[PDB]
């Protein structure tokens, strides 16, 4: 029983997520010339490209181009921006001066990176949008690259976040009033239709919204309601196993992790079957730890900050699923959300407790703060044993370990994969999408001894933390795969790539979309 | 209200403890020759003794002896084992080869140790049993020592533990399927009858079971039910003061420690009066902290692991009591179990709270993780004030302090004792039983000032941690002894001796049995 | 000025390393039958192979085979050993019984591992050699695998270490008296000649010796003298830049790191040019931190233990170089040893000091315990700018980061490589040699910003430690490569693979040999 005022706030927040619509739309130079007739949308325009692209003669045909803009192109630093005023340029806001911000994108890109460097595109547009005068304007963003998918996601990510509690926004269901409408103008008609690019951008931003949201708003219950709302609207199936039913049905892992919390844990499975014959059957599984306090293995306060992001894997997987449904991608999908709060209290699972997992394997809990692998263990067994089909590929996505950052860094999700082919394909999808990945060691024979237990089948924590920490957490999860499953298993550790110093990045959904696209 | 599946599991676990039967039986060479006619029980035999004992001519008359075994005796290292195959040796398993494992026991033994070195006996047999081929076999263990009590307990302790959650054992009420039946074969008919040695072994192993068990299985409630089950079966009295009744009846110490937990605290008192006139009246009191998270003074995770062992003193005292009832030892006994979980939550007793103990004395709580001395304070007052008799001797056993390990180590329980005579006797009982002890400083005049309080009669924590930390915890407990009590008080700190790297040792019950035997 | 007794001890230790000869020799079953005529070398024989290999009919033709050995094969556990006595088997020691120890090697091997699992081979032979009765015996080790290179190195690694200070060995220049001579018997004549396998084994063991040795013995001076000794004996060139001359010649990195120490730092370069036509040119550079106390950024004692291993990269590179010279491999080599002790005192380089590197680039020292990347920076610039040739490939090997263990674990060295091709080749060499490697993220555009400095060209420490810690250290080193260099750069982080719980592994030399072999 919550207070009435808190429950109304939660319902309104749910609705804000279910009805979320993007601020971004897409077009091309010829279509823009034709529809707008050389009238800018507002008093701000943005021009982004490489050193070489910015000097293409076609740039001179752009409606805002003049000798000041030419000088901006000369003075702008690589990775930086440079702004100039253009007097008496026609625009729909009737502004006397138009501000034109040029941004230079590097060409330097390692073999493990996206050649189009959408990371810099995001930062350039963000910086340029900080020069916005008025609210509710439309900003024309002219991009010289034709790498449409990575640019779409990059721009969706950029600028002020749709989630906000600033300046009375709490009374408007935490919908920001500071976001500018963005018109992305490609050089050529995009290889991917504009409406499809919109769906991608929408999923990136929704993912961002879910991750940014504080846990007083995004709970196990509200996340579930959001999933149910999208199921009603788009017509996909939803199965929910809630609270004590998890225990009764043998889901000891997710039950034990989540049982101390105010809001009960939930295993939420979503099903989508395309019209006609599917190219693959794929089961998605996401770590939905709505808040990771550590449990009895309580985190210090420094480390507990930003643990609202611990559901970033569930958000990624959920929004990737939504994109697939909206674009009618020809993949049969399950999406299992492992929703729990890792809370501290009298019902807390303990450091010493022995858990009977859904898989039938027993787990000695060494450290309650290694909760993610436990909920995922139940998730992947569910996906591989309990559904109406057996998947060809299982993809689990999780903000799983600190080791991930040390290993592969802030921009590359770690991949632990049982097959070379599935790994290469996910890497390729990362490089095409801009949501980059990198492999971690796959060597089960060396991971297995780290989990030896006196009394149970396994522990939940490596004996020696300095023995491939990203990999070992992946290994743990694989021990709970059903024997019925003989296909590819892709573990994605996205602990760090889901956020930066401005908040959530919406990393994961576009990665999935691109992966599905190439199956 | 627990889930139905969890409650069924708890009942089954209770029953497994109440009906626990040992895997060990005892006999002697002549009786073995006569009953088995030179046919080994299985494809494994074990031979354990000192360098000199192994070279006794009587060893050559053992049914598995041959020149390869003789060579094993030559090659085996002190404290080590050495295995050989014997071809065409008659055995009940019909194995073509019998494996004979020889183990050499040192003679070196300090004045504070058991001369028969049962510590090494345990490790030798454990190592030998790791060479077991099949399940459910009987292994003949030939021991060359006649120190029957320490060997009985040593062998009961050894090998795989009766508690297990491995390989589906959770569905069999956590009864291990990996334990071998062990036939211990002494050189001479044992000075203590085989059926009596069985009862001792049973108590060692039950104690081990209770200590090994994770706190999701062994709770304040299930521990109580187990005690009640044994009371029905053996016909001894049981008194239970439960939850809020502890507060109403003035038991502020145990109530305050346990009140935050999911399962309520309990003061459980068991009574046994022998048929004859008793040699002594003895009150046992045991720290039954089912799990020590530290309370609001929360333990870090490294330190919180194995805190399921924090009820080792209650297990020891409980199983020593059982043995006394089963063997009808002529001692009048009370056994008070101080059962609580030291949990963290909104009802947690605080660092600053002032407790009114049953004794009438007030305790200022400096640190909630010094919970044991508090529950014991109520326990010993109960024993010395509230029973139908006044004891001559109070023995409290507790996994009480980290200082214990630093002071007396992993194999020797620390003794804090108000009389030289009772101390010497408990030391002698430790040396005879193998469950060795060592004294800590008894000096109340120096302990007393460490507990000075501004507002209460005393604190629960020493001001200066480096001033006889085993002793000061003992001192605290003695301040709550009833003034009606004028007898011997033996405080046994067994923090480390109750476990090793394989889990529980079942340390304590045999110590008590031997102590009672010599009264 | 050292005491006379210490100087004599150091000279003798130097000589022990310079004259080091292996305990291992290699042959095959037919050559063994022919030379030894079915007579075992001693009272111990070892049989090692997979479950399938151990049941090959050819096993029955081995001279020690009998029904007891057959039973051993049945009873042995995967990854374990099992020993039996064989009566009246002919052997050179005239022993009445021969002990035969069987060891089972797993077939399970991930795509990132050596299929022959030499890691288990090492452990099996180690465990078998623990059953050795007498000193100075020869032990026949029958291996059922034909993977000769990885087995050679595996057996060289195994058992008791040639470095010892036990039982008066200090008086014998720390040459162990506990090492058994080992005769490795392959099924077929080895694809690599026995004398070549010996040279490999010798380098593995010498490497192990240098790493095991305490820093009171292996100093910057003695390591130098050892290199000089090998140069005189084998006829290769040696260049030494010592102490203050490092400062005068602009080697500010290695000079600053090492200048606080009792023994001066040294840049030691070795040159080998093969007879004839010109071939691949490779420059090796090794981190030779004889002891890493942390400098002014002092390590706690727990972390400072085993920092004698911090010269493992210099040892690896040195011994790989020796193997190339002994086998006359057709590669032109330089080998630069970056020798320093990272010591604490009044001359200590500081957290704030600004270093002028040999490369001309300035380094702001944030943390003196990140010393390795600094000495290596001077090393690689030396190799790529100061030699009589320019290398095609630079390989640096270093026990560089804690992040390495977290990322790629205890058995896999981390690879940071500027070219896909060179990376793949080093990986292949790891899988063939058994000295396995795994890549870490190569993404200089993301590493570069971590080293931004206010006043110098760069810092020596990442601003954010959780942003690809293995990779960033590698990146730092690459900033000091000469602009004259346009080839492949392979950075090998072997922090953890150079040791296990028994001490040094001798990891690195064989990896190099195999890499050179395939060029
Ligand atoms: Mn988490
Ligand atoms: Mn956690
Ligand atoms: Mn305690
Ligand atoms: Mn405590
Ligand atoms: Mn170092
Ligand atoms: Mn260092």
Residue numbers in the entry:
A (entry chain D), B (entry chain B), C (entry chain K): 3 to 521
From the manuscript:
Leucine aminopeptidase (LAP) is found in all kingdoms of life and catalyzes the metal-dependent hydrolysis of the N-terminal amino acid residue of peptide or amino acyl substrates. We report here the X-ray structures of three kinetoplastid acidic LAPs (LAP-As from Trypanosoma brucei, Trypanosoma cruzi, and Leishmania major) which were solved in the metal-free and unliganded forms, as well as in a number of ligand complexes, providing insight into ligand binding, metal ion requirements, and oligomeric state. LAPs of the M17 family of aminopeptidases are bilobal proteins with a highly conserved C-terminal domain harboring the aminopeptidase activity. They form homohexamers of approximately 330 kDa with the active sites facing a central cavity separated from the bulk solvent but accessible through solvent channels.
The holo TbLAP-A (crystallized in the presence of leucine), TbLAP-A complexes, and LmLAP-A structures have two metals bound in the active site; the TcLAP-A structures, in contrast, clearly show only one metal ion in site 1 and no metal in site 2. In TbLAP-A, the carboxylate oxygen atoms of D294 and E373 and the main-chain and carboxylate oxygens of D371 coordinate the metal ion in site 1 and the carboxylate oxygens of D294, E373, and D312 and the ε-amino group of K289 coordinate that in site 2. Most LAP-A crystals were grown in the presence of manganese ions. As LAPs are reported to be zinc-dependent enzymes, crystals of EDTA-treated TbLAP-A were grown in the presence of ZnCl2. Nevertheless, X-ray fluorescence (XRF) scans of the resulting crystals indicated the presence of manganese ions, suggesting that EDTA may not to be able to efficiently chelate the Mn2+ ions at the concentrations used. A second data set was collected from the same crystal at a wavelength of 1.3052 Å, between the absorption edges of manganese and zinc, and an anomalous difference Fourier synthesis was calculated for the data sets at both wavelengths by using phases from the refined model. The map for the 1.3052-Å wavelength data showed peaks at around 10 σ for both metal sites, substantially larger than the 7 σ peaks for the original data recorded with a wavelength of 0.97949 Å, clearly indicating that neither site was occupied by zinc. The metals were therefore modeled as manganese ions.
